[PDB]
């Protein structure tokens, strides 16, 4: 069931570490370049994971990081397509961040929307869309990673949607408060992602704590338009942040709006200091 022997993998170079595990560049079957994500034991049920992996395997799209194989025994290994430029969040915060302007950032958003539009077409739900879980490759290619993992995490505080490991600031209120995760809560998160892109990786709701964010957002608060960001793009964010989930745009719409942005919407764009 896409399950492979652990010894068919060679984990060669460390690529990163996060709240729930590490990731390595390596070789599969001594011939194939891959990445291997490795999960801290106790993070999720091997059986529940193996079941979900069968779904993850079916998601085949140029803008989704492809699943190749798994090792379901703890520590769980997830074997995927390898992307050479790291997480989008780190990309935005690092040295290249200074060279990115609105046209690059909008194109990256359009690519992400394209992968998510496939997820949407397939009637699936990501649950944790944000720059930390997007990967960058050569030629500023961006792909969505880690589809289907969020639901499986068993961390104590995390299952209560609280604590340092649960991304409250990136999560739609109905999902954060009530666990109502849908493609429309993914759309909200995409709105937050647009803010990450236009602020070069700044945390959302700067200076606000998690509870304050939830309270304020429920009362109608929305993040403002970033400096040098056209109001039309902030309007798109605000559509993603509509209180009624059904009234948020589709990813199909987001993709097309972003792909056409500089001819249909902002043909008069002039580069600024940052965007």
């Amino acid at each position: 069931a896409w399950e492979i022997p652990r010894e068919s993998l060679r984990l060669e170079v460390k690529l990163g570490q996060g709240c729930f595990g590490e990731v390595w560049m390596g070789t599969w079957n001594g011939t194939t370049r891959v990445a291997i994500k490795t999960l801290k034991p106790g993070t999720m049920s091997p059986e529940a994971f193996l079941q979900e992996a069968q779904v993850m395997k079916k998601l085949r799209h140029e803008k989704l990081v492809q699943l190749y194989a798994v090792v379901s025994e703890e520590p769980i290994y997830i074997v995927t397509e390898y992307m050479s430029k790291g997480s989008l969040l780190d990309f935005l915060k690092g040295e290249m961040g200074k060279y990115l302007r609105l046209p690059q950032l909008v194109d990256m958003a359009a690519q992400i929307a394209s992968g998510m539009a496939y997820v949407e077409r397939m009637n699936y739900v990501h649950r944790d869309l944000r720059a930390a879980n997007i990967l960058v490759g050569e030629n500023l290619v961006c792909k969505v990673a880690d589809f289907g993992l969020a639901r499986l995490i068993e961390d104590n505080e995390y299952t209560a949607r609280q604590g340092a490991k649960f991304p409250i600031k990136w999560t739609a209120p109905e999902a954060a408060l009530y666990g109502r995760f849908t493609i429309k809560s993914d759309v909200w998160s995409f709105g937050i992602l647009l803010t990450e892109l236009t602020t070069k990786g700044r945390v959302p709701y700067p200076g606000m704590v998690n509870r304050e964010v939830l309270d304020q957002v429920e009362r109608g608060y929305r993040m403002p338009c970033p400096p040098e960001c056209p109001e039309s793009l902030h309007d798109l964010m605000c559509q993603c942040w509509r209180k009624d989930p059904e009234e948020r745009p589709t990813f199909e719409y987001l993709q097309a709006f972003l792909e056409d942005y500089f001819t249909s919407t902002e043909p008069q764009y002039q580069p600024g200091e940052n965007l």
Binding site: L15, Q17, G18, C19, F20, G21, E22, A132, D146, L149
Partner: peptide, 4 residues
């Protein structure tokens, strides 16, 4: 999750 793997990359912070």
């Amino acid at each position: 999750a793997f990359x912070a």
